[PDB]
Symmetry: D2
Subunit: 354 residues, 4 copies
């Protein structure tokens, strides 16, 4: 692989409803967003069926739950502007029409919830800088003007809260290295300068918090293996060295914290099957990759159910959505085999970044 490659992404965005039912959002062959949801918050639940939002879109959709429990979806429109639509009440399948937020977008949108309950959206703009826009009041359809954070992005952005409420954003830069920028005070428009974490990456960055309140960033490296870096202090400036894990991966990774507090990472492996690795003890060593049967055609997207059970979504060779899950709420649980969530076929609507 080349240093500027961006690994294959997940085919859907997932969120938990206010009642923790999972709901997935993807783009079909009509270039519209469709969604489907669990009827009860358990992995063996039946799903409602695929439902369409009217409107042609030109990016992968991003979804986040508002602080009042209402889901809200963000997408690029045919005008290269940002659009959004929302549930009109928590746990209800009544939505707004797409509504405009304007701007000029050249990446998939990334959405974060500040610790004061306000959504904030991060995107690459027309000038390749990082731009953002935010709710001016918690869970309200009142938004700021667009503002630039500068830089030069060559991946989609990934945002996460630090334990103290400061948003930190990660993105590949012009030199193909991972860069980051952060709020210097929680949920405030006061930001640091851009800083490099060095090392080339060949996927979007994936960010998760550990139990200790430290962030941990996962990405594919230049040799096509998983690499990871973590915060070692109580600020955004002190990081470990990078470490790689053996094993060639062929998609973005997806990371989740299991209910014992240990991290697990899922990725498409060198044989185009889903692979999984997990921390064997706290902060500990990583297990050898374990494979699941079945060829897959996207990165995994990973979620947790109301009872803690992990569930994984992928694109199958039939271009439909498949999923599997843990059979029990237990880190050493067995897994189901792939099951189909049928009714539509999906396309990868990710913005082509070069």
């Amino acid at each position: 692989i080349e240093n500027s490659a961006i690994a294959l992404s997940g085919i859907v965005s997932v969120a938990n409803n206010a009642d923790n039912r999972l709901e997935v959002f993807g783009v079909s062959t009509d270039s519209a967003v469709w969604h489907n949801w669990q009827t009860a918050p358990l992995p063996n639940s039946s799903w409602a069926g695929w439902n369409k939002f009217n409107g042609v879109v030109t990016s992968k959709p991003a979804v986040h739950r508002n602080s009042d429990g209402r889901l809200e979806v963000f997408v690029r429109g045919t005008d290269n502007a940002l659009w959004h639509n929302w549930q009109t009440a928590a746990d209800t399948n009544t939505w707004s029409s797409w509504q405009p937020l304007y701007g000029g977008i050249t990446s998939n949108p990334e959405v974060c919830l500040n610790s004061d309950g306000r959504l904030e959206v991060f995107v690459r703009g027309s000038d390749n800088a990082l731009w953002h826009i935010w709710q001016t009041a918690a869970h309200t359809n009142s938004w700021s003007n667009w503002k630039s954070l500068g830089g030069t992005l060559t991946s989609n952005p990934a945002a996460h809260l630090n334990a103290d409420g400061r948003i930190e954003v990660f993105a590949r830069g012009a030199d193909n290295a991972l860069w980051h920028i952060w709020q210097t005070a929680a949920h405030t428009d006061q930001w640091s300068n851009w800083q490099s974490l060095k090392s080339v990456i060949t996927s979007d960055p994936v960010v998760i918090n550990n139990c200790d309140g430290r962030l941990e960033v996962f990405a594919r490296g230049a040799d096509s293996t998983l690499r990871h870096i973590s915060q070692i202090g109580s600020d955004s400036v002190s990081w470990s060295n990078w470490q790689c894990l053996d094993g060639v991966i062929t998609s973005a990774p997806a990371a989740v914290k299991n209910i014992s507090g240990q991290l697990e990472v899922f990725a498409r492996g060198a044989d185009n099957t889903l692979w999984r690795t997990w921390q064997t003890s706290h902060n500990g060593p990583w297990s050898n990759w374990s494979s699941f049967t079945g060829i897959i055609a996207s990165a995994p997207t990973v979620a947790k159910n109301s009872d803690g059970r992990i569930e994984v979504f992928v694109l199958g060779l039939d271009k439909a959505l498949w999923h599997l899950w843990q059979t029990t709420s237990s880190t050493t649980s067995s897994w189901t085999t792939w099951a189909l969530i049928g009714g539509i076929t999906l396309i990868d609507a990710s913005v082509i970044l070069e």
Copy 2:
């Protein structure tokens, strides 16, 4: 102290709003519930002022946030029945009037949020058994009938979720020992039998989850010192031995997880000042108790702000509410001295259990 003693409780109940502003609920000399809230989600914020709910009450109020962000308060009425009132919209200071849930209550109410978004209330009933009632749909004013879980309670109940979504309830029994009972499947009316954790306790139990996804229970013991016990497996049946910490405490304890994932416990000490102890490392040893200046007249009530800073509320000798907080989002931060949230005086409306 005698084995059947119940240590002095906190004077207010606290909750975070959907936007993480703190809001406190207490009972004044008119035997009504009054509340007050931060105007912004930071500990140095100004407070709005004390506001009254009409109606005479006969217990400490319990408050929990619904899964749609709306706060909801539960109290015993003059008819010894359960009443509740709620915010009509998240982050809004418009409330229902008290509305009846009936029953017959002989303890303070305890409220838990199931992982499927449904509130559930636990109380000691007229026959001294544990009773409960639940929302039948997430964040909806539709409730079940009352149902008994049996047992014999001699403290208020304390409920917490396990990491897998099963509610577990703790309460002192007829033999003054700590007993517990648990859901055997997440957010389902399928419960275990009562089991004893032995050891006498002389306060209500206080329950918190650690990073590992294990519960940890704190209580005052028969010798008036803090003692604690924790889950050691992935179920509700495997527990450690009890351990005590030196130092006589004269109130219920209050426990919180700081933003490095370590536990801290606050209690009124033998000299009637606020004492604090913290875990020095993961699962680690406990620090010597540290004292804050100022005589206090209740147990502490402890909360966290949107930026992770801990804030503590107590009753002062002037029978008003005082608070202090951490100056920075840092485990070794200094603390402010007590500041007054003036405007009313408070009474301890806790149900007298004998």
Copy 3:
């Protein structure tokens, strides 16, 4: 129990030879020291048979291996002075006669090996202060003059190295609290002042190092339960609060680090059987006490074999030595039942401290 009580001690001292064979030393009804040893360094080995050292003694013997592999035993004589005898070559059953070190001794002797290979002996003297004497060259029969460290002792002393090579000594003081004193530079006659760790203790202190390079002290408390305290920094001045464990014990405790690095403690329990507790995770919570069948008449003495297996020695009701051990090198191993090391009967020759 009274605050000045000293719990029942172990009936033998144990050491590993240079080749790791265990060898035990006790006092028989003739008031002489006898010893016995494994013929091979495994717990299921046969033992050689009880062999006598000529000479009447008036304390429990203390044994330590020299830095050249030779065992050396220290005891009080009929003249209340200190005597010692040694193997003349490692792993050889040829010994010196008792040789005099003089002084005036009113406790059992305690022996430590400095990290520069020199033995050092600690005792309570005729004036109840702590006295010591040391080899002036590693593993050589050349000793210093006696020197006082002051204080007032009401238990036997217990000495251990810190991770940086500084000896630290623990002993009960005149107020029945645990006190300690330490070298301020490794293997140097430069010592701190005495400092109290507060808390009353009713056994000799038992000291072990954890993996982290921190000392951890175990003792029986005033309520007859096990209590423990540990270093929390990198010096001898920073300690945790004391914690107690539920369960009444009726002997001194004995502590050992198993081969997974976790601590285990053994003690005679309230029903006069051997009890065991272990840390369930690193630094972690302690298990409930587990009992072994059989009434025992001393504290346990605990050792490890060349393959890591723990072995425990006690006095039986027949006044003979019994032992049991782990069946495999595994923290969850089963244990054998008590087996007799027959041939003599033993007496408790511990110096009566009041």
Copy 4:
């Protein structure tokens, strides 16, 4: 670098005497072994001066302390056989002449001390298999016959004890991967079959035990970066995945456990200076590499002094031995700059393996 490369080795072997004084062994321009020792067991001690053993040698010397405290050195002779010489008494500078152990050696010797006090030597033989020979009685000049363990070696062997006393040997195989073989019972001639840990390595393996009683193996990888793997269970068959650390290294690594139980690794870096990395927390993430001033011409050799302070030895550009050490017994201590141990110049006498 090529896959069959073997990175530059350390220029001396080091051991602690019975009294913990460091003593170093190297080969000078006369192809004889010379040694030098601290006069006192502290890093700022003066050194005695370089002293020669008569006899021409053809490998790097290996040294280990016997279980009776006597050092013993192993080397290949001009006849390609194994020779050894020993201190005739602990802490004494009187040695035997070289004495023959015969055989036919094609690697540097590796020496391990069994947990029953018997030395055992591992070497590549004339047929490229692993051969070994052992003392038949602890710390005695009585040796077994030579015996083969088979395999095909393309590095020097590295041996370490497991926590349960089983020797495990690591060596690169014919496929340039790391292979290992182990005793199936402690200090017994009963061995497993050879098993591969996969991954190519380009240095000798370096093995250390962590606090948990698990082995951890460090080596340079095919991309010239440090990689490491560790045991995850209680046996020799369960290992983690391999992880790499960023940063090109140009020598074998050297690993040590500091006195807080954390691991540190030293290696010559890409700029030919000494680099260091350390675990920032238990099992934790690894720090960025830190450089010391000064160009160096060998791998580091690392030892610990009687007070826990780490000391590092290297070859300088002047072909003499230099060292530096920690200024205090503290993981965050500063370090001294390089100081010369002058008097001879050293050559790399490592056996050329192809």
